[PDB]
Structure formats: structure tokens, C-alpha cells
Amino acid sequence: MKKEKIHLEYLLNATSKNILWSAISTPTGLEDWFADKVVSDDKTVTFCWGKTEQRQAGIVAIRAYSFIRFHWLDDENERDYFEIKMSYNELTGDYVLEITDFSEADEADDLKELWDSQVSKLRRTCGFLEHHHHHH
Numbered sequence: 059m060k061k062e063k064i065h066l067e068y069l070l071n072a073t074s075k076n077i078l079w080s081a082i083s084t085p086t087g088l089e090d091w092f093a094d095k096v097v098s099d100d101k102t103v104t105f106c107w108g109k110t111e112q113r114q115a116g117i118v119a120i121r122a123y124s125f126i127r128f129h130w131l132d133d134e135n136e137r138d139y140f141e142i143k144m145s146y147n148e149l150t151g152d153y154v155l156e157i158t159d160f161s162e163a164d165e166a167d168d169l170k171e172l173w174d175s176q177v178s179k180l181r182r183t184c185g186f187l188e189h190h191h192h193h194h
Contacts, residue, residue: 072151076123
């Protein structure tokens with residue numbers, strides 16, 4: 059009936075730094091692994107695919123890599139809110155990666171398939187292998 063808030067934890071190896079998801083705050087960082095092209099402006103990110111249909115999303119809050127929040131200019135206040143944290147474990151070297159998503163009970167089954175698919179796979183690949191495929 060009402061969406062559930064879920065923080066999804068991914069274990070990233072000590073080889074990988076903060077720059078992974080800290081890249082999404084900058085144009086050249088984001089378009090390196092997101093969309094065809096990303097043209098930025100002050101406090102607004104403009105995504106450009108094939109010159110037909112280009113989108114904009116404003117930042118809510120951010121600090122280095124401890125947390126970063128994106129939210130659309132079209133979706134000003136409803137359900138399109140996602141944020142990404144990462145923290146450096148000084149006791150081992152590896153990163154704890156925490157993404158805040160909203161999903162219904164029926165959709166949480168998909169997100170838990172994405173949970174087990176990623177957390178088990180990062181171990182056997184030793185680093186990264188992305189399978190949280192583009193839905194919404």
C-alpha cells in the first residue's frame with residue numbers, strides 16, 4: 059500500500075576508492091558510466107542522450123562521499139528520491155556502500171534478488187560485477 063525504505067549494503071574491495079559513486083556528483087564522472095552524455099550546471103545535472111529528450115535533476119544534499127542525494131526537477135516531491143553513502147573502514151580498508159531506495163512488498167522481492175545477486179557476486183568476482191539492471 060505504502061512504499062518501504064530499504065538501505066542496500068554492497069561490500070566493495072579495498073582496491074576500490076570513494077571515487078566510484080563520488081563520480082555521480084560531477085559531469086565527466088557520471089557520463090563515464092551513465093547515459094550517452096551528461097552536461098552539468100550549478101546545483102542541476104542535465105542528462106543528454108541523442109539530442110532528442112534531455113532531462114534535469116537537482117541535488118538535495120551532499121558531503122564528499124558520506125552521502126549524496128538526487129531528485130528530479132519534474133518530480134519535485136513524490137517518490138523519485140534515491141541517495142548513496144560510502145564509508146572507509148580504517149580497520150580493514152574495504153568500503154561499506156549504502157543505497158537508500160523505496161519499494162513496495164511485491165517490488166522488495168526484486169530488490170532482495172538484486173541484494174543476493176550483488177553481495178554474493180562481488181565476493182566471487184573479487185571487486186565489481188553490476189546486475190541491478192535499469193528499471194525506473
